[model samples]
Target: SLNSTGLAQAAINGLNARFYESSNARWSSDEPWWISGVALTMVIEYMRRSGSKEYLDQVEDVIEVQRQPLSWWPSGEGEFRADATDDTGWWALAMVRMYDLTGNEDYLNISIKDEAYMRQWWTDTECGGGLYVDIQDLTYKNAIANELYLKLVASLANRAPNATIYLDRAQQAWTWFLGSGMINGVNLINDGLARDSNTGSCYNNRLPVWTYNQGVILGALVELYHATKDESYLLSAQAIADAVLSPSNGLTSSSGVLTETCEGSDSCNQDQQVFKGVFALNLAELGDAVAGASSDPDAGQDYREYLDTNMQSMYANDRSEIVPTLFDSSTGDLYDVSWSGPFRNATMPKQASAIGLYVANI
Candidate 1:
């Protein structure tokens, strides 16, 4: 029977095909630390869940590759700069996962140092001390950036030695986000608020809601629930999960596949292409939280079914082993930006996107 085990093997196969030895086990040869680091974290997840040590060496090697002279991994060079606060947030989350999986204090140490560096990006000069989208560019306060910040803080609080400080920071970030009007009337998260040059204030531009924004907040809330044993956090997480499942949002298709609004169009960029996979990843995390805290079997079962349906669809859709986009592949398995799609050539971000979806199933 095709289950989580089958999905895990296919994910591992994709990882092996994409991995480049010269790039220190990174899936994308041209991509830099953060992108590869994101892919490697899922490799770690696959290892932990499947109880397979086959990829442990690759995981360790990628960790070494991304270890900057300072605390955080660098974003890309050239047109893509490395100064984004959330760039480090991605690495911080990856490092914490490494610590949890390997019992390595070095990974946690890197995360702590990264966390300290991340705090510098937080400023009250903006809209009530939320994180700037990037350190180099202060004009925008991004929802995903701060959501990643909240997730990193809450995750560190749950796992780190000094729990109270980050716990407070998590609460502060969450409170600001709730009041930021970023969640909107529909209960889904938007892109972020733009900084007003005239008043020196921030306001929501009412941008489209991306799947990752919905994702990281759920993870952050789950972490908060575990940390404080707070039912409110769980309720909040449940609300977001419900929001995703709602038909009006069109986040998922009737067949249980995740399809973004920008799927068939040119609007989906490299980063945006992978956001739905992030949604799937955190959906599994939310499932764990519900299973642990609530007596409601339906909620937990619904999440499991969501995972199962998506995973099955992903496995069924995958066509070729070469690029391995997983969720959507046709005509010899060329990659496509959309999870349900016509195939195109593979890119780094799209390849990395499949990792989390496959890991969630495992």
Candidate 2:
């Protein structure tokens, strides 16, 4: 019975009532660290899209709870911890989103600080010039880290002062990323780079190109285009989005709902469970970039329709009412990991992921 905006608001309310705890000013402790930050970002996005400030004042409280206090910090500075590169990027992006909405200097400063934190792991040591997956383990250079770097730096450039620094970093990251051989013959990004220890060489790992990997770079490219006005970046972005939208590729079902391969067997781990929502979030960004660059308003129409289908299917087939014992509100909506149907179970990551699409439609 609900339309797009109403459903998105309902989903956000459901997530807040089910997982959020105002007593502690945090999401449920059961949530994984990175996801709580991402959830905050998506809620900010909902506020931005809907022109509603419902969650505005409550943001900093959640950020305080997400902070981890890394050993590297000097003192009296606990923004968010640098647990891992990808994990760190999630909060950085969240702060960026919060900064976008409120123009709060604290959030902007924190977001810029995250760029410096990511740079500590960045090296030119032939793992294709990308940020390391984490400081704790240095060898792995993965898609999420590099994609986040590209997106983050470009995004920072759009708002940060002395824009050249971030724009240059954005171009450098993308140049290395494009030549890194990660995007395969089908134009999809793999898991990451593999090294030949003997010769100090790197190449695409031939890994499972999770939808999130495919997703983040689109926003990165779009941001790069925004800062530089480079149509080439937009063209490249379209290529990747087209690769996912094509039904022959299996990223989507015959009915046009976005799907992740692992979800079919119920084999997805916690991190993988959140991938499709990431894709939807960034896909919406790329669509806006596409439509904005064209004289014709119809330019990203296909993307809008595609997202609407996913949103409709999610509202219709995937949501389940939480059992009364799980939370105080039995009517709270819990989304399935698989957006298609056969509602299985719920977790904070799964619920946050689905809320991403709900907000994307708005």
Candidate 3:
């Protein structure tokens, strides 16, 4: 009688109880960056949808778990990263949302405090040209991280009006992704373009066709457009989103996602990829300017359908790698990627990402 709402709440509560008791103070992530970010984002969505205050409490707990020194540190240093590549940007978003929803300045201040490190990681050199996905290595700049940090900049601007320093860096970072990151009018910039500014071979190598990177850039572009009202950012976002989502653009080259994101070398990263859909949904929310949707007759109906479908897909089955850790919809196997993958002994799913699973069911 309570409908899907009741079932969802029950499951969330079950997971919540288990997580509190068993997950903290342990090494649990395979790829903490992707894992922590998406988990936090999902908690935001679930809480928003259910209006459950308890979920918010869990989110704070999850954030604390992500910040653990041992779990999120760089390989040698064990320090927190400062960009969107991992929980850096995700935490930034979480803090911003917490402030927005709860008006708590503590959350906002944490990100603010970390902004210096975040800005440093965005560039590969002191000359301030190229960006790195993470600071530890300047090997490559991930398009996803590059784009979302721009949004982080915008978010920070709202909270700290005097922090104009980040504004230029954010704009510059967006420009680089747009200009150098595109493959066939699609944004694949993070695939490699990260030059050592000397040895090109040292560049990061990844499939240019990453939905995660594109999703973040699209939403960030929308945010940039709003911040500047500059048609350039909106136009860039529209072009990229249209290319990635539109089959007609013909930019589809299947990487690990088609075979299921988990089958790759890092096949255990099922949770990291799941967050891309949220980026897409947020991009759509930025409205006509960023999404470039004119007042077409069908825009109203189509937009509604798109959003409904997106929501249905992400929340549909516990199939998402983050929750329902026992099921793999792609292989239908009862295997936990976190156990077998990178986060062999980590505390959070972010630490558990040896593989990713991002499919836009919507």
Query: Each prediction's Cα lDDT score?
Result: 0.74, 0.84, 0.48
Kindly report the root-mean-square deviation of model 1 from the true structure over all alpha carbons: 4.5
In the range 51-93, model 1's lDDT, one tens digit per residue, is 8777787777766655634334244321112477777788778
In model 2, residue pairs whose N, Cα or C atoms come closer than 3 Å (at least 3 residues apart or on different chains), thus clashing, are none
lDDT per residue, candidate 2, 1-362, as tens digits? 44656666666777887788888677776657778777888889988888888777787778766564645543425667465788788889988888888888888888888898789889886665888885777878988989988999999989998789999999999999999999998888999999986988998899887999988899999999999898899899889999999999889899999999897777988788888888999999999989989999899888888999998888789988656654465355788798886787777788888888988778
Q: Tens digits of per-residue lDDT for model 3 on 1-362? A: 12334434443443343333436521233334554555555455445544667666656666676565543355422223433354566667666666766777777776675565566665445323545665555555555555557777766765665656656767776565455534443343334453455654233444535455556666676666666767776666656655554544332223111112342555434454343444444544444453344555554343334434433332332233334445532211111222212322222342111112221111
TM-score winner among the candidates? 2
RMSD of each: 4.5, 2.4, 7.3
- lDDT order, best first, reads 2, 1, 3
Instruction: Compare candidates 1 and 2 on TM-score and give the better one.
Output: 2
Q: What is the Å distance of residue 232 in model 1 from its true position?
A: 0.8
- Where's the lowest-lDDT run of ten residues in candidate 3? 353-362
Task: Give the C-alpha miss distance for residue 46 in model 1, angstroms.
Answer: 1.0
Report lDDT (Cα) of residue 84, candidate 2. Answer: 78
